[PDB]
Each structure stands twice: as structure tokens, then as C-alpha cells.
Design a binder for this molecule. Structure first.
Ligand SMILES: O=C(C1CCCCC1)N1CC(=O)N2CCc3ccccc3[C@@H]2C1
Lengths: 218, 218
């Protein structure tokens, strides 16, 4: 039957998996927990059969899985998108972790009261990270060529996210901008983003110092 | 010719890759940068041919690679250790990210002046993370059975590391303790740990609030 994807009803860790499932035109159900609903989760937490209980979880009946990167790589794996030979698979994994750099970087410093003096710091590093993708896309449509791999949706979510921190960070990175529009112009992604299903906010969990609330940026 | 592994001469991100190379009895050379030696790196940084310049890097001549997880998964991949089918590969990736939870968790909070009020926090979560591995090993020799996979050396390094934060954190987790002794009793790991090659400290980069210096714990 339909896979279950469970996470908080935020963007957070699972957003790229959602966009990949949407792109692959795959059926899945979600358990979203809303913010009053910790208790819900803590209960079910250990009755679900996960060996490493966590959120997000992905249950299949081939598979019960709890790490966001194990989940997105599995879905991709199931569709042959993962690699191809050690070299190609390493390519994709290096792209993966090159965008976690950016995205986990937001997250390190969201939740600090010190966010604001932290922010200024992390924005000095951003453009050097960005330039690396911009250079990558200087001759490709997608991160790995003419074909969407899972890290393209990781990068879309990173870009989506760092644009709330500093709406000007992609002036200067015109390929990166077009890449963004390009993902939004895939018709499954277009549909989904118009969907009742699309969770537009928060970026992180509701309590965080940036991306939280049910809000506005910074 | 021999692969090059470049990192700071600390344990840090690359320690599990080193132990895997050692276990697989593979030849590699390292470029270690010492602490006076930022400038060294920044120079070479962009003359090395890495598409995403970073440390650690791994150069092969099939491959120039810069994300620690892309590097260790490649070396493992090259030796067939990675997976086997989408399900098995997801198993290994979930174990991977279940131990980054612990290890990146140290790292989040090393480098803060607030480490000490941060420490107390993170130690409340540790035992719940630990219990998950302890339960996992309750019937296996290694994380995935009777055979070492790359996440076993990830877990060894995590354990090695959280033992400096709280030398008592594994009283209570006797399987975890034996797993540690068990990795140290593999003869390639035994040799290496006795080696001139073994970098015993620092755990993180020299400037960090825990695991830094050329030191003692906490
Ligand atoms: O614990 C982790 C793991 C959890 C398991 C799956 C892998 C990551 N973290 C979570 C986290 O918040 N950060 C802070 C930001 C950051 C930046 C660079 C490198 C690492 C990190 C870590 C990664």
C-alpha cells in the first residue's frame, strides 16, 4: 500500500524528499505533526517499529527508515537515480554534502538567541559556497547534467531557505536564480507548489530564532 | 599511484575514513595541515582541481572528492561494502546518519563559549541515542552483522569522542563498550592505533572549546 512519510508540518529536513516524491509522481501519505502535538509523537515514537525512532520516518513495508538522508537516497535509489558506478555515486554524494553545508548551516545558527551576530558571520561564507554551485551550473541544466537528481531538490530547498535570511544573496548568482525558476517550472513541482499540500512555512521548527513562528523572514 | 587524503592533522571529520583505509589495508598518502598552516591550505585550495574545494579532500585520478561522507562512501563503495540492494543501502545510510547525530552533536556545541551550559543539555539526549545502538548490537557483532561496514568506524570515532566529554557515558551500555574493544582488537586497527600515523588529538580543530588544544578532555 501507499508509503507513509511522517514529519512535523514544517519544511525542515523533509522538504527535498517531498519535492522528489512529487517529481517522481509517486503516491505517499503523510503524518504531519503540528506544534501542539509533540505528545502525539512521543507516544507513537516507539510503537511504530523504527529501529532508530526519529522524525522524519519513512515506512514502506519493504522498509521502515528514520534518517532524512537515508530516506531521500532510498527513494532515489528505488528509481535508479543514485549513482551508476562508484565514481558517479560519489559525485552525487559530494553534491549532497556540499548543499547540507549551506542548509545545516542555517540550522546550526537558527535557535540561538545569538542568531543575529551569528547570521552576519555565516553570510560571509555563503557566497563562497554559492559560487561553487554557480560554477557547477555554468554548463549544466541540473547539478549533474540534463537530468534532475535528488541534490537538485536539496539545492532548491537551500536556496528557498537562504533567501529568507538575505533576499539579496543570489543577486550575483544568475545561474543559481535561473536554476531556481527552472525547478519551479517542472510541471509536478509547479502543481505541488500550488497545492493544498505545500507547506510554505515554517522553514525550521516553530520555536526557532529564524524560520520559525508562522511568519515573515529573519 | 597512491591516493592522497588531505585534512588537518586532527581527528575531526576524517578519522573514520582513516580507520577504514587502515582496515581495508589500503595504501594512501596524507597531506596533513598543522595549525600554523591555514595559509598553506588557502593557497593550494583552488589549485588542486576540486570542484568543491574543502578539507578533507580525496584524490585518486579516477576521482577528486571533498565531502567527508562522499569520501568514506566511495572508498567503501570501491570495495563493495556499501549496500547490495536499495534496502540494504538504506540500512547502511540510516546507521550512518544515526551516528552523525551523535558526532555532529558534539561539534555543534564545541566552539561555543556557552559550551558548558550546552554540554549539560546534550548529555540528556545522548543516552537515548546510545540506547539505540546498544539495542542494535544486542544480537550483532557489528552494526550490520558479522561484518564491518563503514558505520562501525563512524561509531567507533563517536564513542571515542563522547568519552572525553563524559567518561562515564557508556557505563550502562556494555555492548557498546565491547563493540569499542572489538574494533580495537582488529589487527589492522591495533597496528594503526600504535602507529606513528595515529593522530590522537585534537578531536576537533585546535581552537574549539571542547576537543581542541593539544590536550586533556572537556
Ligand atoms: O548531527 C548532525 C547529523 C545528524 C544525522 C545525519 C547527519 C547530520 N548534524 C546536525 C546539525 O545540526 N549540524 C549543524 C550544522 C552542520 C554543519 C556542517 C556539518 C555538520 C553539521 C551538523 C550535522
Amino acid at each position: 500500500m501507499s508509503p507513509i512519510l511522517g514529519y512535523w508540518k514544517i519544511k525542515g529536513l523533509v522538504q527535498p524528499t517531498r519535492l522528489l516524491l512529487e517529481y517522481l509522481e509517486e503516491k505517499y501519505e503523510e503524518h504531519l505533526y503540528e506544534r501542539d502535538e509533540g505528545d502525539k509523537w512521543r507516544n507513537k515514537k516507539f510503537e511504530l517499529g523504527l529501529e532508530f525512532p526519529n522524525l522524519p520516518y519513512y515506512i514502506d513495508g519493504d522498509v521502515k527508515l528514520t534518517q532524512s538522508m537515508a530516506i531521500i537516497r532510498y527513494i532515489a535509489d528505488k528509481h535508479n537515480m543514485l549513482g551508476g558506478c562508484p565514481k558517479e555515486r560519489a559525485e552525487i554524494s559530494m553534491l549532497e554534502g556540499a548543499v547540507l553545508d549551506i542548509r545545516y548551516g542555517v540550522s546550526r545558527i537558527a535557535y540561538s538567541k545569538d542568531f543575529e551576530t551569528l547570521k552576519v558571520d555565516f553570510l560571509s561564507k555563503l557566497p563562497e559556497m554559492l559560487k561553487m554551485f554557480e560554477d557547477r551550473l555554468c554548463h549544466k541544466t541540473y547539478l549533474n547534467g540534463d537530468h534532475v537528481t535528488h541534490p537538485d531538490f536539496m539545492l532548491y530547498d537551500a536556496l528557498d531557505v537562504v533567501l529568507y535570511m538575505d533576499p539579496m544573496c543570489l543577486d550575483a548568482f544568475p545561474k543559481l536564480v535561473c536554476f531556481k525558476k527552472r525547478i519551479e517550472a517542472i510541471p509536478q513541482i509547479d502543481k505541488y507548489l500550488k497545492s493544498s499540500k505545500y507547506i510554505a512555512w515554517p522553514l525550521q521548527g516553530w520555536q526557532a530564532t529564524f524560520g520559525g513562528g508562522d511568519h515573515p523572514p529573519k
